[PDB]
C-alpha cells in the first residue's frame, strides 16, 4: 500500500467534558474512553454503538488501559488513585492508592499481572493486579510523568516526562537501565515501545515525533508537519495494513505518516478541537480519535488498507 483511505464512519457523543484517552480492547470488540467528566464509556469498536458507562472516580480521568484478555480495565484519575474494573459487570475490583498527585498514565503488562502508572508526583509505580498493592515506587523523573509502557515480554518499562528524559526500567528489579536525551531537552510528551519491542516512538513538544533505537541510542526516523507544542498526545504504530505512524495534533487533525519514508500520507479532518488521543484497532484498519473540551466527541475511521 502507498497511502490509506481512512474515512469517517461513526461519531461517538456522550462525554460531557474533554475526552482524555481512547483504547481498543485486545480482542477487537470494544473501545474504552476516559474523560475529564470522571467517567469511562464502552463503545462497540465496529459500529460505534454505545454500550455502557463505568463510574466511580471522584475527579477527572486521564487514561485507561485494557488487560490482555479484554476483561479488565485500569483507569488513572486526578483523585490520585487508579481503579481496576471488571468491564462486563462494571464493578470496581480494586482501588490502587499511593500516588500523592494526579495519576496521568497507566498500562498493564502483557501477562496482565502488573500495572504500571505515572503521576504528576514525578514517580512511576508498579502494582500487583491481584492484590492491588504497590510493589515498587521508582524515583523516575523530576517533572510529571507523561507516559509509561511495557515492552512485548513485560521485562522492560519505558517512561517519559516533561523533564526532557526518556528512561528504560527493569521491571523485575526497578533499576534504571538507560536515560535517553535529545538536543535542547524539549519536554517528552509521549513514548511507547514498537510492537516488535526493538524501538521507541517518542513525541517532544517541538512539533516532532521520532523513532529511536533505544539500545544504540540512535534516532532512526523523524516525523513532522503536525502541531504539538502544548499537550501530551498519544501516538501509535499502525500495523494491520500499511505500516504507518498515527498521531493527534493541536490543529484538530489526525496525522498519518509512512513509517519508512516519513511522508504524511493522510490527514483526517472532522474534529473541532485538539485531537488528544488516537488508537489503532488490533486486526482491522480502524482508527479511533478523541478531542478536547470544545469538541468532546470520539470518531471511528476505516480504511481499505
Ligand atoms: C503541568 O504541566 C503539564 C501539563 C500537561 C497537560 N495535559 C493535562 C491534561 C491532559 C493532557 C494529556 C492527555 C492525554 N493523555 C493522557 C494520558 N496520556 C496522554 C497522552 C489528557 C489530559 C487530561 C486529563 N484529564 C483529566 N483531562 C484531560 C483533558 F485534557 F482531556 F481534558 C495534557 O497534555 C501534562 C503534564 O504532565 C503529564 C504536565
Amino acid at each position: 500500500p502507498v497511502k490509506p483511505n481512512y474515512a469517517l464512519k461513526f461519531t461517538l457523543a456522550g462525554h460531557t467534558k474533554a475526552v482524555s484517552s481512547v483504547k481498543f480492547s485486545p480482542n477487537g470488540e470494544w473501545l474504552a474512553s476516559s474523560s475529564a467528566d470522571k467517567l469511562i464509556k464502552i463503545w462497540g469498536a465496529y459500529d460505534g454503538k454505545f454500550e455502557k458507562t463505568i463510574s466511580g472516580h471522584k475527579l477527572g480521568i486521564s487514561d485507561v488501559a485494557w488487560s490482555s484478555d479484554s476483561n479488565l480495565l485500569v483507569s488513572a484519575s486526578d483523585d490520585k488513585t487508579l481503579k481496576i474494573w471488571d468491564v462486563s459487570s462494571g464493578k470496581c475490583l480494586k482501588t490502587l492508592k499511593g500516588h500523592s498527585n494526579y495519576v496521568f498514565c497507566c498500562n498493564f503488562n502483557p501477562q496482565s499481572n502488573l500495572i504500571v502508572s505515572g503521576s504528576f508526583d514525578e514517580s512511576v509505580r508498579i502494582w500487583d493486579v491481584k492484590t492491588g498493592k504497590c510493589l515498587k515506587t521508582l524515583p523516575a523523573h523530576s517533572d510529571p510523568v507523561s507516559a509509561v509502557h511495557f515492552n512485548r515480554d513485560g521485562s522492560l518499562i519505558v517512561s517519559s516526562s516533561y523533564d526532557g528524559l526518556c528512561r528504560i526500567w527493569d521491571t523485575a528489579s526497578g533499576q534504571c537501565l538507560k536515560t535517553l536525551i535529545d538536543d535542547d531537552n524539549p519536554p517528552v510528551s509521549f513514548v511507547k515501545f514498537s510492537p516488535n519491542g526493538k524501538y521507541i516512538l517518542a513525541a517532544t513538544l517541538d512539533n516532532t515525533l521520532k523513532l529511536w533505537d533505544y539500545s544504540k541510542g540512535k534516532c532512526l526516523k523523524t516525523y513532522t508537519g503536525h502541531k504539538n507544542e502544548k499537550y501530551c498526545i498519544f501516538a501509535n504504530f499502525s500495523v494491520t495494513g500499511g505500516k504507518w505512524i498515527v498521531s493527534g495534533s493541536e490543529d484538530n487533525l489526525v496525522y498519518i505518516w509512512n513509517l519508512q519514508t516519513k511522508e504524511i500520507v493522510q490527514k483526517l479532518q472532522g474534529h473541532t478541537d485538539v485531537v488528544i488521543s488516537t488508537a489503532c484497532h488490533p486486526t482491522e484498519n480502524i482508527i479511533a480519535s478523541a478531542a478536547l473540551e470544545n469538541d468532546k466527541t470520539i470518531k471511528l475511521w476505516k480504511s481499505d488498507c
Side-chain angles (χ1 to χ4, degrees), residues 15 19-25 31-35 38-43 54 57 60-67 72-77 82-85 87 103-108 115-116 148 190 234 277-279 298:
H15 284 295
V19 182
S20 50
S21 190
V22 294
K23 310 271 182 81
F24 285 106
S25 66
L31 186 74
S33 61
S34 57
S35 164
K38 315 168 199 302
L39 307 175
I40 298 160
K41 287 172 187 292
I42 310 296
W43 321 75
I54 296 181
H57 279 296
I61 305 174
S62 296
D63 204 5
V64 287
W66 291 92
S67 66
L72 306 180
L73 279 170
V74 63
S75 52
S77 170
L82 301 105
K83 280 177 186 287
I84 305 179
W85 311 89
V87 183
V103 194
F104 185 67
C105 49
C106 56
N107 258 312
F108 282 94
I115 287 161
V116 64
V148 290
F190 185 74
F234 288 94
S277 171
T278 53
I298 301 153

Side-chain angles (χ1 to χ4, degrees), residues 257-275:
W257 294 264
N258 182 309
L259 191 148
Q260 291 297 327
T261 75
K262 313 159 271 188
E263 328 161 280
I264 297 169
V265 296
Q266 189 176 10
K267 315 158 127 163
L268 312 181
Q269 168 186 213
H271 283 291
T272 63
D273 202 352
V274 174
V275 181

Side-chain angles (χ1 to χ4, degrees), residues 2 14-15 43-44 53 76 85-86 122 128 135 164 174 176 178 189 198 233 239 259 270 275:
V2 158
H15 284 295
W43 321 75
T53 298
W85 311 89
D86 176 271
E122 307 179 357
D128 181 72
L135 298 177
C176 187
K178 198 135 173 163
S189 44
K198 178 31 91 203
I233 298 181
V239 298
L259 191 148
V275 181

Side-chain angles (χ1 to χ4, degrees), residues 4 14 32 55 120 128 141 153 269 271 286 296 305:
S55 91
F120 277 66
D128 181 72
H141 291 283
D153 72 355
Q269 168 186 213
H271 283 291
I286 303 173
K296 302 167 316 183
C305 63

Side-chain angles (χ1 to χ4, degrees), residues 120-190:
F120 277 66
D121 71 13
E122 307 179 357
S123 77
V124 166
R125 290 191 176 240
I126 304 171
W127 313 80
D128 181 72
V129 166
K130 183 87 208 133
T131 67
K133 309 320 253 212
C134 183
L135 298 177
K136 287 181 169 66
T137 300
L138 313 185
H141 291 283
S142 55
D143 278 304
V145 180
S146 54
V148 290
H149 189 232
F150 283 99
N151 70 340
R152 57 156 30 260
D153 72 355
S155 64
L156 300 177
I157 296 163
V158 64
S159 66
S160 55
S161 165
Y162 275 61
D163 65 7
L165 307 187
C166 171
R167 284 181 157 153
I168 302 265
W169 307 86
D170 184 74
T171 299
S173 64
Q175 156 183 42
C176 187
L177 300 181
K178 198 135 173 163
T179 294
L180 292 130
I181 61 157
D182 202 0
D183 293 347
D184 297 312
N185 308 316
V188 190
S189 44
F190 185 74

